[PDB]
Amino acid sequence: RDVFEVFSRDGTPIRGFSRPGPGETVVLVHGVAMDRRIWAESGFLDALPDAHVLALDLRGRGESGRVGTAEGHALRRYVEDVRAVLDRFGRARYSLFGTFFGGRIALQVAAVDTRVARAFSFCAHAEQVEIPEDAVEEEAVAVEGPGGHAYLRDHFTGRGAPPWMVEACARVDPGELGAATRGLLHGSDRRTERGHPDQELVLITADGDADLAPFHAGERRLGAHLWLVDAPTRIKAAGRLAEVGRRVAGVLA
Ligand SMILES: COC(=O)C[C@@H](NC(=O)[C@@H](NC(=O)[C@@H](/N=C1/NCC(=O)N2CC[C@@H](C)[C@H]2C(=O)N[C@@H](C(C)C)C(=O)N[C@H]1C(C)(C)C)C(C)(C)C)[C@@H](C)c1ccccc1)c1nccs1
């Protein structure tokens, strides 16, 4: 792997790795309490042996610049972070894959960037969501304080998350956990749109998801394809991420 840095629209440095390959260029977008190490740890990366893989750390996570404000964590800023990565590698065609909120990011990048030929959203749908201000602020307080990593660890353990997902939370600065959480009140509630007719949009979730309605809504509204994995919940579906990688590799082939 090679490392890269790019600068987002607002000056934030965005750092990542490039794993060269002869195949399609795939850009990987992690979730809120994660960093780019999840792709190797989950087995997703080994499922794409031929692809040119680009994996960034979103702002405030991993090796990328610190933010520390809620508006700095607005959805539009993460979209700018990903588009900067698309600029550095100069391709006309990219396939994006995002986990959890990273899926929402990938969908929004697809809406605005005609270089995105495919976008895959793992365990996130594309529809409008009502965000309860009070509960999100409460969660920001929990995650940003001294007990914040333990709060997330305990929650994800108790819901059967894979170990890599449990462990990743402790690698995120508590101040950025709080700011990213508050950032969800700045634009993340809106639905995403289709960027252009030829785009391939894929949503992935647990067959046991308690709320499949918005996933079906995306099939209808966006012409998205819905992929199911065997799991009772979205968190547990993350145990199937390597398997999903193999299915992505079948599309890219
Ligand atoms: C139903 O969702 C689940 O089954 C768990 C699942 N979450 C999500 O799919 C989505 N979100 C949510 O549904 C709600 N949102 C929350 N908090 C905002 C939020 O998400 N976070 C703040 C901390 C950060 C780790 C992240 C998170 O995970 N928090 C958990 C908490 C229980 C540990 C958490 O969901 N809390 C809740 C409350 C309200 C209880 C505080 C909502 C409807 C208000 C948007 C994410 C992907 C998203 C955010 C914005 C736009 C669209 C989607 C995940 N499992 C692992 C990673 S994401």
Q: Alpha-carbon distance 30 to 106, whole Å?
A: 10
β-sheet with 13-19: strand ranges across: 2-7, 13-19, 52-56, 25-29, 94-99, 116-122, 200-206, 225-229
Q: Alpha-carbon distance 171 to 9, whole Å?
A: 25
**Within-domain flag for 106:** yes
* CATH code, domain carrying 197: 3.40.50.1820
8 Å CB contact between 45 and 37? no
**Within-domain flag for 158:** no
What range defines the domain where residue 104 resides?
A: 2-128+188-252
Burial code of 70-101, b = ≥16 C-beta within 10 A, e = fewer? bebbbbebbbbbbbbbbebeeeeebbbbbbbb
State the DSSP code for 71.
G
Tokens (6 digits) for 250: 């079948």
Q: Alpha-carbon distance 28 to 57, whole Å?
A: 9
Q: What is the resolution of this structure in A?
A: 1.4
Q: Alpha-carbon distance 190 to 18, whole Å?
A: 31
The SS3 of residue 29 is strand
Q: Alpha-carbon distance 191 to 193, whole Å?
A: 7
In the numeric block, the tokens 């909120």 are attached to: 101
In the numeric block, the tokens 């060269």 are attached to: 20
**Nearest atom in ligand 1 to 165's CA:** 56
**Within-domain flag for 180:** no
**Nearest atom in ligand 1 to 233's CA:** 4
Q: How many angstroms separate the alpha carbon of residue 22 from the centre of ligand 1?
A: 36
